[PDB]
Homo-oligomer: A and B are copies of this chain.
Amino acid sequence: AAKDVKFGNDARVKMLRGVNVLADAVKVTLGPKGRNVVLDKSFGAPTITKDGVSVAREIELEDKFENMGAQMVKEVASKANDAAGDGTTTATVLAQAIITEGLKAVAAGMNPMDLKRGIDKAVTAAVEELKALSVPCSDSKAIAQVGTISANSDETVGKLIAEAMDKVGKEGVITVEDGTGLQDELDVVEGMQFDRGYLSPYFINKPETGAVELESPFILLADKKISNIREMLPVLEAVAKAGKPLLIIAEDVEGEALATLVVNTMRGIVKVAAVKAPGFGDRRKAMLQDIATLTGGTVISEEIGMELEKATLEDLGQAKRVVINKDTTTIIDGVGEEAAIQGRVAQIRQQIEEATSDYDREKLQERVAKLAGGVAVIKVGAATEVEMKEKKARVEDALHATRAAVEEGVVAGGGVALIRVASKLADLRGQNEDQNVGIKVALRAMEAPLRQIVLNCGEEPSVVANTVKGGDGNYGYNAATEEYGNMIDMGILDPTKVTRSALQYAASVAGLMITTECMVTDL
Contacts and interface: CB of A to CB of B under 8 A. Distances in A.
Interface of A: 1-3, 5, 7, 11, 15, 21, 24-25, 28-29, 32-33, 35-40, 44-46, 48, 55, 58-62, 64, 67-68, 71-72, 74-76, 79, 104, 107-109, 111-113, 152, 182, 199-200, 202, 216, 225-229, 234, 236-244, 250-260, 262-263, 265-267, 269-270, 272, 276, 313, 382-387, 390, 458, 460-463, 466, 504-505, 507-509, 512-513, 515-523
Contacts of A512: 36, 48, 384, 386-387, 390
B111 A33 contact: yes
A237 B240 CA distance: 20
Given A108-B108, A237-B257, A250-B243, A71 B59 contact: no
Most buried by B among A28, A46, A48, A313: A46
B113 A109 contact: no
Contacts of A517: 28-29, 35-37
B256 A270 contact: yes
Contacts of A61: 2-3
A202 B266 CA distance: 14
Given A38-B11, A109-B458, A515-B36, A260 B267 contact: yes
Most buried by B among A35, A55, A108, A504: A35
Contacts of A55: 518, 520
Contacts of A258: 240-241
Contacts of A240: 254, 256-258
Contacts of A64: 40
A338 B399 CA distance: 44
Given A25-B518, A243-B250, 15 more contacts: A3-B60, A28-B517, A36-B517, A38-B68, A38-B72, A55-B518, A108-B109, A109-B458, A113-B152, A225-B241, A255-B267, A260-B269, A383-B507, A386-B508, A463-B466
A454 B460 CA distance: 15
Contacts of A21: 5
Most buried by B among A55, A68, A79, A270: A270
A112 to B, nearest CB: 6
A242 B276 CA distance: 11
Nearest to A110: B108
B266 A242 contact: no
A109 B441 CA distance: 14
A383 B265 contact: no
26 contacts: A3-B61, A5-B21, A5-B25, A25-B518, A38-B516, A40-B522, A55-B518, A76-B384, A79-B383, A104-B109, A225-B243, A226-B241, A227-B237, A239-B254, A243-B251, A243-B253, A259-B269, A260-B267, A382-B508, A383-B508, A384-B508, A386-B509, A387-B508, A387-B512, A390-B512, A463-B463
Nearest to A68: B46
B520 A25 contact: yes
Nearest to A108: B108
A44 B494 CA distance: 32
Q: Which 6 A-B pairs have the closest CB atoms?
A: A243-B252, A255-B269, A35-B517, A40-B521, A240-B257, A460-B462
A42 to B, nearest CB: 8
A1 B58 CA distance: 10
A461 B75 CA distance: 34
Given A68-B40, A384-B505, A466-B463, A266 B270 contact: no
A462 B254 CA distance: 62
Contacts of A108: 107-109
